[PDB]
Tab-separated table of C-alpha atoms in Angstrom:
chain	number	residue	atom	x	y	z
A	14	UNK	CA	-109.076	-91.971	-62.417
A	15	UNK	CA	-107.419	-94.229	-59.316
A	16	UNK	CA	-109.744	-97.153	-60.675
A	17	UNK	CA	-109.566	-96.881	-64.648
A	18	UNK	CA	-106.037	-96.287	-64.431
A	19	UNK	CA	-105.021	-99.370	-62.143
A	20	UNK	CA	-107.520	-101.015	-64.661
A	21	UNK	CA	-105.125	-99.697	-66.705
A	22	UNK	CA	-102.266	-101.222	-65.323
A	23	UNK	CA	-104.006	-104.463	-64.643
A	24	UNK	CA	-104.374	-104.811	-68.425
A	25	UNK	CA	-100.795	-103.813	-68.895
A	26	UNK	CA	-99.469	-106.585	-66.474
A	27	UNK	CA	-101.698	-109.139	-68.081
A	28	UNK	CA	-100.414	-108.315	-71.426
A	29	UNK	CA	-96.174	-109.027	-69.972
A	30	UNK	CA	-97.021	-112.074	-68.307
A	31	UNK	CA	-99.185	-113.852	-70.870
A	32	UNK	CA	-96.272	-113.133	-73.716
A	33	UNK	CA	-93.181	-113.651	-70.708
A	34	UNK	CA	-95.027	-117.480	-70.393
A	35	UNK	CA	-95.878	-118.192	-74.013
A	36	UNK	CA	-92.610	-117.536	-74.951
A	37	UNK	CA	-90.975	-119.752	-72.353
A	38	UNK	CA	-92.963	-122.691	-72.648
A	39	UNK	CA	-92.169	-121.779	-76.735
A	40	UNK	CA	-88.136	-122.537	-75.668
A	41	UNK	CA	-89.342	-125.748	-73.055
A	42	UNK	CA	-91.040	-127.008	-75.876
A	43	UNK	CA	-88.449	-127.169	-78.195
A	44	UNK	CA	-86.132	-128.274	-75.969
A	45	UNK	CA	-87.563	-131.089	-74.939
A	46	UNK	CA	-88.666	-131.783	-78.670
A	47	UNK	CA	-85.085	-131.477	-79.606
A	48	UNK	CA	-84.338	-134.585	-77.836
A	49	UNK	CA	-82.651	-135.968	-74.542
A	50	UNK	CA	-81.720	-139.739	-73.811
A	51	UNK	CA	-83.193	-141.359	-70.735
A	52	UNK	CA	-82.027	-142.207	-67.441
A	53	UNK	CA	-83.317	-144.333	-64.873
A	54	UNK	CA	-87.109	-142.613	-65.669
A	55	UNK	CA	-87.071	-144.846	-68.871
A	56	UNK	CA	-88.751	-143.954	-72.508
A	57	UNK	CA	-92.204	-145.569	-72.441
A	58	UNK	CA	-92.860	-143.557	-69.280
A	59	UNK	CA	-90.716	-140.582	-69.654
A	60	UNK	CA	-92.524	-140.144	-73.372
A	61	UNK	CA	-95.926	-140.399	-72.368
A	62	UNK	CA	-95.052	-137.608	-69.595
A	63	UNK	CA	-93.474	-135.195	-72.569
A	64	UNK	CA	-96.589	-135.997	-75.059
A	65	UNK	CA	-98.504	-135.216	-72.012
A	66	UNK	CA	-96.302	-132.115	-71.528
A	67	UNK	CA	-96.055	-130.965	-74.955
A	68	UNK	CA	-100.360	-131.043	-74.902
A	69	UNK	CA	-100.870	-129.419	-71.863
A	70	UNK	CA	-98.357	-126.206	-73.136
A	71	UNK	CA	-100.617	-126.404	-76.660
A	72	UNK	CA	-103.551	-126.176	-74.514
A	73	UNK	CA	-101.901	-123.167	-72.715
A	74	UNK	CA	-100.904	-121.143	-75.768
A	75	UNK	CA	-104.647	-122.033	-77.339
A	76	UNK	CA	-106.560	-120.318	-74.722
A	77	UNK	CA	-103.710	-117.139	-74.574
A	78	UNK	CA	-104.612	-116.864	-77.831
A	79	UNK	CA	-108.046	-117.129	-76.365
A	80	UNK	CA	-107.627	-114.938	-73.623
A	81	UNK	CA	-105.789	-112.402	-76.439
A	82	UNK	CA	-108.756	-112.000	-78.524
A	83	UNK	CA	-110.786	-111.011	-75.457
A	84	UNK	CA	-108.249	-108.552	-75.004
A	85	UNK	CA	-108.516	-107.339	-78.499
A	86	UNK	CA	-112.690	-107.568	-77.888
A	87	UNK	CA	-112.342	-105.428	-74.762
A	88	UNK	CA	-109.986	-103.272	-76.809
A	89	UNK	CA	-112.886	-102.315	-79.375
A	90	UNK	CA	-115.694	-102.195	-76.374
A	91	UNK	CA	-113.278	-99.805	-74.227
A	92	UNK	CA	-112.624	-97.443	-77.401
A	93	UNK	CA	-116.551	-97.260	-78.119
A	94	UNK	CA	-117.902	-97.191	-74.976
A	95	UNK	CA	-114.979	-95.215	-73.362
A	96	UNK	CA	-114.287	-92.642	-75.758
A	97	UNK	CA	-116.440	-89.263	-74.376
A	98	UNK	CA	-115.015	-87.666	-77.229
A	99	UNK	CA	-116.842	-89.681	-79.752
A	100	UNK	CA	-119.633	-89.672	-77.949
A	101	UNK	CA	-119.900	-86.222	-77.492
A	102	UNK	CA	-119.109	-85.729	-81.375
A	103	UNK	CA	-122.061	-88.336	-81.821
A	104	UNK	CA	-124.564	-86.633	-80.367
A	105	UNK	CA	-124.195	-83.194	-81.071
A	106	UNK	CA	-125.020	-85.115	-84.380
A	107	UNK	CA	-128.075	-87.174	-83.973
A	108	UNK	CA	-129.396	-83.716	-82.204
A	109	UNK	CA	-129.153	-81.647	-84.722
A	110	UNK	CA	-130.485	-84.176	-87.516
A	111	UNK	CA	-133.552	-84.668	-85.229
A	112	UNK	CA	-134.366	-80.967	-84.751
A	113	UNK	CA	-133.338	-80.459	-88.105
A	114	UNK	CA	-136.063	-83.209	-88.901
A	115	UNK	CA	-138.523	-82.241	-86.441
A	116	UNK	CA	-138.458	-78.196	-87.522
A	117	UNK	CA	-139.315	-78.701	-91.024
A	118	UNK	CA	-142.665	-81.518	-90.196
A	119	UNK	CA	-143.717	-78.580	-87.764
A	120	UNK	CA	-143.350	-75.989	-91.003
A	121	UNK	CA	-145.455	-78.356	-92.872
A	122	UNK	CA	-148.085	-78.775	-90.768
A	123	UNK	CA	-148.050	-75.348	-89.722
A	124	UNK	CA	-148.736	-74.904	-93.100
A	125	UNK	CA	-151.168	-76.889	-93.641
A	126	UNK	CA	-152.848	-75.858	-90.146
A	127	UNK	CA	-153.172	-72.930	-92.885
A	128	UNK	CA	-154.819	-74.969	-95.835
A	129	UNK	CA	-157.214	-76.570	-93.745
A	130	UNK	CA	-158.442	-72.939	-91.677
A	131	UNK	CA	-158.522	-71.316	-95.351
A	132	UNK	CA	-160.510	-74.583	-96.142
A	133	UNK	CA	-162.339	-74.164	-92.349
A	134	UNK	CA	-163.460	-70.433	-93.301
A	135	UNK	CA	-165.319	-70.895	-97.256
A	136	UNK	CA	-167.231	-74.178	-95.498
A	137	UNK	CA	-168.429	-71.951	-92.073
A	138	UNK	CA	-169.227	-69.028	-95.258
A	139	UNK	CA	-170.923	-71.596	-96.843
A	140	UNK	CA	-173.089	-74.228	-94.467
A	141	UNK	CA	-173.997	-70.708	-92.741
A	142	UNK	CA	-175.582	-69.133	-95.130
A	143	UNK	CA	-177.580	-72.226	-96.681
A	144	UNK	CA	-180.886	-71.557	-97.542
A	145	UNK	CA	-182.855	-75.254	-96.550
A	146	UNK	CA	-184.836	-73.706	-93.334
A	147	UNK	CA	-186.410	-76.894	-92.404
B	29	UNK	CA	-105.557	-120.622	-84.679
B	30	UNK	CA	-108.291	-122.094	-88.146
B	31	UNK	CA	-111.015	-121.805	-85.627
B	32	UNK	CA	-110.084	-117.897	-84.691
B	33	UNK	CA	-110.019	-116.993	-88.255
B	34	UNK	CA	-112.981	-118.868	-88.964
B	35	UNK	CA	-114.869	-116.329	-86.281
B	36	UNK	CA	-112.681	-113.794	-87.689
B	37	UNK	CA	-113.578	-114.042	-91.479
B	38	UNK	CA	-121.964	-107.310	-86.605
B	39	UNK	CA	-121.452	-106.775	-82.753
B	40	UNK	CA	-119.375	-103.729	-83.461
B	41	UNK	CA	-121.494	-102.177	-85.368
B	42	UNK	CA	-124.568	-103.032	-83.155
B	43	UNK	CA	-122.961	-101.528	-80.666
B	44	UNK	CA	-122.208	-97.974	-82.416
B	45	UNK	CA	-125.893	-98.004	-82.747
B	46	UNK	CA	-126.395	-98.602	-79.521
B	47	UNK	CA	-124.043	-95.711	-78.426
B	48	UNK	CA	-125.982	-93.599	-81.016
B	49	UNK	CA	-129.354	-93.494	-78.567
B	50	UNK	CA	-127.775	-94.974	-74.995
B	51	UNK	CA	-124.356	-93.647	-73.896
B	52	UNK	CA	-123.720	-96.443	-71.707
B	53	UNK	CA	-121.159	-96.677	-68.983
B	54	UNK	CA	-118.995	-98.977	-68.012
B	55	UNK	CA	-118.685	-101.265	-64.164
B	56	UNK	CA	-117.323	-104.359	-63.604
B	57	UNK	CA	-118.301	-106.754	-66.112
B	58	UNK	CA	-122.077	-106.081	-66.575
B	59	UNK	CA	-121.189	-102.797	-68.962
B	60	UNK	CA	-124.937	-100.451	-67.744
B	61	UNK	CA	-126.898	-97.863	-69.358
B	62	UNK	CA	-128.767	-94.766	-68.837
B	63	UNK	CA	-132.932	-95.162	-68.751
B	64	UNK	CA	-134.001	-92.262	-67.534
B	65	UNK	CA	-134.741	-88.712	-68.210
B	66	UNK	CA	-131.960	-88.090	-64.923
B	67	UNK	CA	-129.636	-86.480	-66.927
B	68	UNK	CA	-133.075	-83.751	-68.035
B	69	UNK	CA	-133.603	-82.817	-64.817
B	70	UNK	CA	-135.865	-85.567	-63.714
B	71	UNK	CA	-136.355	-86.012	-59.649
B	72	UNK	CA	-137.359	-89.245	-59.976
B	73	UNK	CA	-135.553	-91.897	-57.271
B	74	UNK	CA	-135.565	-94.843	-60.030
B	75	UNK	CA	-132.399	-96.193	-61.055
B	76	UNK	CA	-132.747	-96.586	-64.965
B	77	UNK	CA	-129.543	-99.298	-65.225
B	78	UNK	CA	-130.370	-101.646	-68.230
B	79	UNK	CA	-127.823	-104.916	-68.778
B	80	UNK	CA	-126.237	-105.729	-72.136
B	81	UNK	CA	-125.038	-109.283	-72.803
B	82	UNK	CA	-123.158	-111.039	-75.088
B	83	UNK	CA	-126.275	-113.299	-76.196
B	84	UNK	CA	-124.370	-109.914	-81.912
B	85	UNK	CA	-126.083	-108.321	-78.656
B	86	UNK	CA	-128.756	-108.261	-76.111
B	87	UNK	CA	-130.480	-105.194	-74.163
C	16	UNK	CA	-125.493	-67.010	-43.971
C	17	UNK	CA	-122.272	-66.475	-45.756
C	18	UNK	CA	-121.445	-67.352	-49.285
C	19	UNK	CA	-117.979	-69.767	-49.142
C	20	UNK	CA	-116.821	-70.127	-52.835
C	21	UNK	CA	-114.428	-73.181	-52.911
C	22	UNK	CA	-112.203	-72.696	-55.928
C	23	UNK	CA	-109.290	-75.094	-57.487
C	24	UNK	CA	-106.913	-73.742	-60.631
C	25	UNK	CA	-104.768	-74.911	-62.870
C	26	UNK	CA	-103.905	-74.367	-66.692
C	27	UNK	CA	-104.595	-75.625	-70.390
C	28	UNK	CA	-102.573	-74.994	-72.904
C	29	UNK	CA	-104.311	-73.780	-75.942
C	30	UNK	CA	-102.914	-76.592	-78.441
C	31	UNK	CA	-104.688	-78.645	-75.522
C	32	UNK	CA	-108.067	-76.705	-74.995
C	33	UNK	CA	-110.066	-79.399	-77.926
C	34	UNK	CA	-109.339	-82.064	-75.835
C	35	UNK	CA	-109.820	-80.496	-72.491
C	36	UNK	CA	-113.118	-79.335	-74.071
C	37	UNK	CA	-114.395	-82.654	-75.293
C	38	UNK	CA	-113.546	-84.501	-71.805
C	39	UNK	CA	-115.612	-81.806	-69.779
C	40	UNK	CA	-118.541	-81.471	-71.901
C	41	UNK	CA	-118.681	-85.723	-72.538
C	42	UNK	CA	-118.104	-85.468	-67.897
C	43	UNK	CA	-120.599	-82.539	-67.967
C	44	UNK	CA	-124.174	-81.967	-67.046
C	45	UNK	CA	-125.815	-82.471	-70.746
C	46	UNK	CA	-125.841	-78.517	-71.932
C	47	UNK	CA	-123.574	-76.644	-74.633
C	48	UNK	CA	-121.334	-74.396	-73.945
C	49	UNK	CA	-122.281	-70.437	-72.490
C	50	UNK	CA	-119.524	-68.764	-74.432
C	51	UNK	CA	-119.079	-66.084	-72.204
C	52	UNK	CA	-116.936	-62.700	-72.628
C	53	UNK	CA	-116.946	-60.775	-69.262
C	54	UNK	CA	-115.060	-57.404	-68.820
C	55	UNK	CA	-113.991	-57.137	-64.958
C	56	UNK	CA	-112.749	-53.836	-63.170
C	57	UNK	CA	-111.585	-53.855	-59.691
C	58	UNK	CA	-111.699	-50.432	-57.201
C	59	UNK	CA	-109.716	-50.606	-54.516
C	60	UNK	CA	-110.773	-48.242	-50.678
C	61	UNK	CA	-106.957	-46.755	-49.599
C	62	UNK	CA	-108.631	-47.004	-45.896
C	63	UNK	CA	-107.412	-46.018	-42.469
C	64	UNK	CA	-106.816	-49.569	-42.591
C	65	UNK	CA	-103.537	-50.883	-44.089
C	66	UNK	CA	-105.801	-53.331	-46.158
C	67	UNK	CA	-107.712	-51.691	-49.353
C	68	UNK	CA	-111.331	-53.245	-49.913
C	69	UNK	CA	-111.344	-55.085	-53.046
C	70	UNK	CA	-114.777	-54.774	-55.427
C	71	UNK	CA	-114.645	-56.602	-58.633
C	72	UNK	CA	-117.036	-55.071	-61.380
C	73	UNK	CA	-117.855	-57.508	-64.119
C	74	UNK	CA	-120.471	-56.818	-67.207
C	75	UNK	CA	-121.228	-59.369	-70.180
C	76	UNK	CA	-119.479	-57.772	-72.989
C	77	UNK	CA	-121.448	-60.962	-75.173
C	78	UNK	CA	-125.461	-60.241	-73.855
C	79	UNK	CA	-127.957	-57.546	-73.546
C	80	UNK	CA	-129.578	-55.851	-70.334
C	81	UNK	CA	-127.348	-58.689	-68.169
C	82	UNK	CA	-126.987	-57.089	-64.859
C	83	UNK	CA	-123.622	-55.940	-63.315
C	84	UNK	CA	-121.811	-58.397	-60.895
C	85	UNK	CA	-120.828	-57.103	-57.797
C	86	UNK	CA	-118.618	-59.562	-55.765
C	87	UNK	CA	-116.477	-59.119	-52.729
C	88	UNK	CA	-114.062	-62.478	-51.834
C	89	UNK	CA	-112.391	-61.615	-48.843
C	90	UNK	CA	-109.570	-64.013	-47.221
C	91	UNK	CA	-108.101	-67.417	-47.716
C	92	UNK	CA	-109.874	-69.638	-44.792
C	93	UNK	CA	-107.377	-72.577	-45.818
C	94	UNK	CA	-105.890	-74.388	-42.557
C	95	UNK	CA	-106.165	-77.703	-42.942
C	96	UNK	CA	-104.642	-80.483	-45.498
C	97	UNK	CA	-107.488	-82.878	-45.936
C	98	UNK	CA	-109.292	-80.245	-48.279
C	99	UNK	CA	-106.947	-78.645	-50.995
C	100	UNK	CA	-109.645	-76.291	-51.882
C	101	UNK	CA	-108.936	-71.753	-50.903
C	102	UNK	CA	-112.107	-71.121	-48.738
C	103	UNK	CA	-112.864	-66.906	-49.011
C	104	UNK	CA	-116.192	-65.541	-47.650
C	105	UNK	CA	-118.157	-64.999	-51.579
C	106	UNK	CA	-120.967	-61.318	-51.267
C	107	UNK	CA	-122.742	-61.634	-55.065
C	108	UNK	CA	-124.897	-58.935	-55.757
C	109	UNK	CA	-126.068	-57.774	-59.276
C	110	UNK	CA	-126.390	-54.138	-59.424
C	111	UNK	CA	-128.077	-51.148	-61.745
C	112	UNK	CA	-125.130	-49.470	-64.249
C	113	UNK	CA	-124.852	-46.390	-62.183
C	114	UNK	CA	-122.930	-48.990	-60.292
C	115	UNK	CA	-119.952	-47.632	-61.617
C	116	UNK	CA	-120.216	-43.724	-61.222
C	117	UNK	CA	-122.298	-44.846	-57.942
C	118	UNK	CA	-119.251	-46.066	-56.446
C	119	UNK	CA	-116.205	-43.328	-57.747
C	120	UNK	CA	-118.493	-40.992	-55.989
C	121	UNK	CA	-118.605	-43.206	-53.065
C	122	UNK	CA	-114.182	-42.802	-52.930
C	123	UNK	CA	-114.058	-46.457	-55.313
C	124	UNK	CA	-110.535	-45.526	-56.861
C	125	UNK	CA	-110.453	-48.198	-60.648
C	126	UNK	CA	-107.422	-50.673	-60.290
C	127	UNK	CA	-107.105	-52.721	-63.196
C	128	UNK	CA	-108.912	-54.126	-66.053
C	129	UNK	CA	-108.993	-57.465	-67.711
C	130	UNK	CA	-111.871	-58.275	-70.073
C	131	UNK	CA	-112.013	-62.585	-70.033
C	132	UNK	CA	-113.715	-64.934	-72.987
C	133	UNK	CA	-113.807	-68.498	-72.077
C	134	UNK	CA	-116.749	-71.277	-72.072
C	135	UNK	CA	-118.723	-72.322	-69.153
C	136	UNK	CA	-119.950	-75.489	-67.565
C	137	UNK	CA	-121.929	-76.908	-64.485
C	138	UNK	CA	-122.074	-80.317	-63.330
C	139	UNK	CA	-124.488	-80.664	-60.582
C	140	UNK	CA	-123.140	-77.421	-58.241
C	141	UNK	CA	-119.555	-77.254	-59.005
C	142	UNK	CA	-118.842	-75.081	-62.426
C	143	UNK	CA	-116.057	-75.481	-64.587
C	144	UNK	CA	-114.802	-72.233	-66.564
C	145	UNK	CA	-112.079	-72.472	-69.332
C	146	UNK	CA	-111.133	-69.081	-70.497
C	147	UNK	CA	-108.422	-66.956	-71.383
C	148	UNK	CA	-107.344	-63.594	-69.727
C	149	UNK	CA	-106.955	-60.346	-72.050
C	150	UNK	CA	-105.208	-57.361	-70.780
C	151	UNK	CA	-107.344	-54.595	-71.567
C	152	UNK	CA	-105.547	-52.810	-74.464
C	153	UNK	CA	-106.014	-48.854	-73.371
C	154	UNK	CA	-108.716	-48.671	-70.484
C	155	UNK	CA	-111.050	-46.995	-73.074
C	156	UNK	CA	-110.176	-49.567	-75.599
C	157	UNK	CA	-112.586	-52.376	-74.278
C	158	UNK	CA	-112.077	-53.840	-78.066
C	159	UNK	CA	-108.455	-53.848	-78.027
C	160	UNK	CA	-107.128	-56.575	-75.306
C	161	UNK	CA	-103.515	-58.038	-75.060
C	162	UNK	CA	-103.743	-61.714	-74.422
C	163	UNK	CA	-101.832	-62.207	-70.793
C	164	UNK	CA	-100.357	-65.289	-71.879
C	165	UNK	CA	-101.444	-68.230	-74.511
C	166	UNK	CA	-102.271	-70.598	-71.508
C	167	UNK	CA	-106.033	-70.827	-70.700
C	168	UNK	CA	-107.255	-70.547	-67.062
C	169	UNK	CA	-109.468	-73.595	-65.947
C	170	UNK	CA	-111.348	-72.789	-62.781
C	171	UNK	CA	-113.360	-75.309	-60.832
C	172	UNK	CA	-115.716	-73.382	-58.201
C	173	UNK	CA	-118.311	-74.025	-55.744
C	174	UNK	CA	-119.739	-71.384	-53.657
C	175	UNK	CA	-122.122	-72.691	-50.844
C	176	UNK	CA	-122.828	-72.035	-47.422
C	177	UNK	CA	-119.684	-72.393	-44.919
C	178	UNK	CA	-121.076	-75.657	-43.264
C	179	UNK	CA	-121.474	-77.524	-46.116
C	180	UNK	CA	-118.432	-79.089	-47.258
C	181	UNK	CA	-119.441	-82.299	-48.811
C	182	UNK	CA	-119.689	-80.098	-52.040
C	183	UNK	CA	-115.937	-79.006	-51.852
C	184	UNK	CA	-114.736	-82.595	-51.595
C	185	UNK	CA	-116.872	-83.593	-54.386
C	186	UNK	CA	-114.864	-81.070	-56.090
C	187	UNK	CA	-111.996	-81.812	-55.482
C	188	UNK	CA	-112.501	-85.765	-56.567
C	189	UNK	CA	-113.400	-84.120	-59.613
C	190	UNK	CA	-110.226	-82.052	-60.766
C	191	UNK	CA	-108.276	-85.423	-59.625
C	192	UNK	CA	-110.567	-87.481	-62.048
C	193	UNK	CA	-109.527	-84.755	-65.237
C	194	UNK	CA	-106.087	-85.037	-64.009
C	195	UNK	CA	-104.873	-86.967	-66.630
C	196	UNK	CA	-105.847	-84.538	-69.214
C	197	UNK	CA	-104.552	-81.606	-67.195
C	198	UNK	CA	-103.941	-80.835	-63.353
C	199	UNK	CA	-105.832	-78.483	-61.158
C	200	UNK	CA	-104.563	-77.879	-58.070
C	201	UNK	CA	-104.828	-74.839	-55.106
C	202	UNK	CA	-102.595	-72.549	-55.769
C	203	UNK	CA	-101.691	-69.610	-52.566
C	204	UNK	CA	-102.441	-66.062	-54.385
C	205	UNK	CA	-99.029	-64.801	-52.710
C	206	UNK	CA	-96.418	-65.156	-55.166
D	11	UNK	CA	-113.221	-94.529	-85.188
D	12	UNK	CA	-112.242	-95.800	-88.876
D	13	UNK	CA	-109.293	-96.269	-87.058
D	14	UNK	CA	-109.664	-98.475	-83.968
D	15	UNK	CA	-111.819	-101.044	-87.053
D	16	UNK	CA	-108.438	-101.015	-88.803
D	17	UNK	CA	-106.370	-101.318	-85.694
D	18	UNK	CA	-109.055	-104.518	-84.661
D	19	UNK	CA	-108.675	-106.491	-88.322
D	20	UNK	CA	-104.746	-105.944	-88.546
D	21	UNK	CA	-105.243	-107.404	-84.661
D	22	UNK	CA	-106.511	-110.441	-85.889
D	23	UNK	CA	-104.652	-110.982	-88.884
D	24	UNK	CA	-101.215	-110.178	-86.959
D	25	UNK	CA	-102.168	-113.229	-84.002
D	26	UNK	CA	-104.262	-115.749	-86.732
D	27	UNK	CA	-100.570	-115.036	-89.090
D	28	UNK	CA	-98.598	-116.136	-85.823
D	29	UNK	CA	-100.298	-119.273	-84.534
D	30	UNK	CA	-100.110	-120.510	-88.235
D	31	UNK	CA	-96.275	-120.779	-88.100
D	32	UNK	CA	-96.347	-121.761	-84.680
D	33	UNK	CA	-98.385	-124.396	-85.822
D	34	UNK	CA	-96.107	-124.886	-89.182
D	35	UNK	CA	-92.882	-124.824	-86.876
D	36	UNK	CA	-93.805	-127.746	-84.701
D	37	UNK	CA	-95.052	-129.284	-87.712
D	38	UNK	CA	-91.510	-129.210	-88.884
D	39	UNK	CA	-90.461	-129.986	-85.299
D	40	UNK	CA	-91.842	-133.716	-85.701
D	41	UNK	CA	-90.320	-134.256	-89.483
D	42	UNK	CA	-88.416	-136.538	-89.943
D	43	UNK	CA	-87.288	-135.266	-92.501
D	44	UNK	CA	-87.063	-131.124	-91.551
D	45	UNK	CA	-86.169	-130.223	-94.916
D	46	UNK	CA	-87.413	-126.491	-94.171
D	47	UNK	CA	-83.774	-125.719	-92.814
D	48	UNK	CA	-82.837	-121.528	-93.181
D	49	UNK	CA	-87.163	-121.449	-94.426
D	50	UNK	CA	-87.658	-122.853	-90.753
D	51	UNK	CA	-85.274	-120.096	-89.204
D	52	UNK	CA	-86.989	-117.505	-91.857
D	53	UNK	CA	-90.905	-118.684	-89.889
D	54	UNK	CA	-89.378	-118.084	-86.487
D	55	UNK	CA	-88.370	-114.856	-87.200
D	56	UNK	CA	-91.599	-114.004	-88.974
D	57	UNK	CA	-93.401	-115.235	-85.838
D	58	UNK	CA	-91.247	-113.497	-83.330
D	59	UNK	CA	-91.283	-110.001	-85.401
D	60	UNK	CA	-95.466	-110.026	-85.295
D	61	UNK	CA	-95.231	-111.142	-81.811
D	62	UNK	CA	-93.129	-107.933	-81.125
D	63	UNK	CA	-95.745	-105.912	-83.250
D	64	UNK	CA	-98.316	-107.366	-82.090
D	65	UNK	CA	-97.594	-106.212	-78.271
D	66	UNK	CA	-96.720	-102.981	-79.588
D	67	UNK	CA	-99.550	-102.452	-81.431
D	68	UNK	CA	-101.646	-103.482	-78.053
D	69	UNK	CA	-99.548	-100.944	-75.868
D	70	UNK	CA	-100.390	-98.107	-78.298
D	71	UNK	CA	-104.083	-99.065	-78.319
D	72	UNK	CA	-104.434	-98.871	-74.387
D	73	UNK	CA	-103.011	-95.683	-74.329
D	74	UNK	CA	-104.928	-94.352	-76.256
D	75	UNK	CA	-108.548	-95.402	-74.055
D	76	UNK	CA	-105.904	-93.761	-71.145
D	77	UNK	CA	-106.158	-90.260	-72.951
D	78	UNK	CA	-109.833	-90.369	-73.218
D	79	UNK	CA	-110.023	-92.221	-69.605
D	80	UNK	CA	-110.905	-90.614	-67.165
D	81	UNK	CA	-113.240	-93.354	-64.508
D	82	UNK	CA	-116.471	-90.964	-64.955
D	83	UNK	CA	-119.133	-92.462	-66.219
D	84	UNK	CA	-119.927	-89.203	-68.571
D	85	UNK	CA	-123.763	-87.469	-67.896
D	86	UNK	CA	-124.620	-85.913	-71.467
D	87	UNK	CA	-127.117	-87.568	-73.446
D	88	UNK	CA	-129.699	-86.954	-75.626
D	89	UNK	CA	-132.361	-87.937	-74.450
D	90	UNK	CA	-134.238	-84.382	-74.948
D	91	UNK	CA	-133.904	-83.792	-78.359
D	92	UNK	CA	-134.768	-87.988	-78.646
D	93	UNK	CA	-138.028	-87.455	-76.754
D	94	UNK	CA	-138.773	-83.658	-78.454
D	95	UNK	CA	-138.505	-85.678	-82.106
D	96	UNK	CA	-140.482	-88.510	-80.833
D	97	UNK	CA	-143.407	-86.399	-79.674
D	98	UNK	CA	-143.205	-84.090	-83.130
D	99	UNK	CA	-143.671	-87.418	-85.180
D	100	UNK	CA	-146.611	-88.814	-83.160
D	101	UNK	CA	-148.004	-85.852	-83.826
D	102	UNK	CA	-148.079	-85.447	-87.198
D	103	UNK	CA	-149.062	-89.083	-87.710
D	104	UNK	CA	-152.049	-87.823	-85.343
D	105	UNK	CA	-153.048	-85.198	-88.117
D	106	UNK	CA	-153.170	-87.298	-90.722
D	107	UNK	CA	-155.153	-89.668	-89.394
D	108	UNK	CA	-157.720	-86.552	-88.796
D	109	UNK	CA	-157.023	-85.734	-92.585
D	110	UNK	CA	-157.441	-88.903	-93.378
D	111	UNK	CA	-160.791	-89.712	-92.000
D	112	UNK	CA	-162.514	-86.020	-93.410
D	113	UNK	CA	-161.691	-87.301	-96.505
D	114	UNK	CA	-163.094	-89.838	-95.961
D	115	UNK	CA	-166.524	-88.552	-94.956
D	116	UNK	CA	-166.155	-86.100	-98.013
D	117	UNK	CA	-165.558	-89.069	-100.150
D	118	UNK	CA	-168.380	-90.126	-98.598
D	119	UNK	CA	-170.592	-87.441	-99.391
D	120	UNK	CA	-169.712	-87.903	-103.338
D	121	UNK	CA	-170.545	-91.367	-103.028
D	122	UNK	CA	-174.450	-89.987	-103.118
């Protein structure tokens, strides 16, 4: 399936890139935080810049977890929507159930028709034979 | 993380019932379904494509 | 007009019959499978022409009052590589039971007999048949047969007028889209 | 299909766990007295293992889709049986209504 196959390839590429980016970001944050002397740049500014970088990295990792939550959502949707096997079985089951229900209903209806018809016969034998004579 | 855990501990059951009646298909990001009898041999030129949106879901 | 049949032939092992059938039903038009058993006998005429005319007669053993079918399929017309399908001239005639006696009295001599058991699905014009060839055990004994091989045979065929070819393109696209479960390709009859 | 449900559950659980682990580790990083030395290393190991596990599970689950994947949107529907059953139920309802009306007229007759 070119379309679906290309989509699977893109999903694999996204997972690999996100995992690599998260690991690299974590390693960079760890060394930077382990800590280093300031030369020319100076703590005031260098420290504030490091704080901003750490906050940005945390925001990137928090939303890299949201992207994976979205990936889990897509996994569930495709397992439910693109699983034709499951669909075949479900359709078959609902169909059998509905058909049996309909048939049972019909049997009941016919027997009723039958009972109502017998009552109608009795009434047709009556009303017609009534003396009355306006 | 705690926000994700609060959003972790019904959409799926609903979509499952939807599968039970509509057999939907995948295109782009606007997943669609069939709302015509074209499967049961009806030659009516009309697109019975109902959308599914996240709002636990709306049709 | 003459009827050309586009055929793409590929194989499925039995252990994947279940999955294949599932996918097939899911993609093919909303019908139950037809479960068809067919007994086919091949008759050839040793004419002055070196090529012998070969006529195949099929009787359904699973149904009652279904007319025997006589089908003639001539040499392949495959030429261009931008079609990936065996295009052959096809003439299909429903016939009465006396057909056997008629053909043997006409000179046609029976060749081989193979029963086929399998499922029939149709997608639009396209019809997909997954069947297993049982080499008849004893020509008289239709009851006894020998499965030729473990793998079942998947054939996708569209028989349409020679001018039509869009349907054959659709057949090629559909076979390609059935590739992850199994591979259907045009295999030349020669060897 | 409960398999997919269990998979999703495991996924969410592992993700939340790894997030919490990362949080704790960075909190201990800023800590002036990181008493959790070996404990911290154990946490790092656990987090790494969790990520690896998640990745493997995800790849396997993705293949699951490819095995049933085909691009084709699938035609086969239950529209036929459903429509038939709906028609039948409506017919039975109509019959019930008529029966009730006749019963009411008979009751009226008796009431005099």
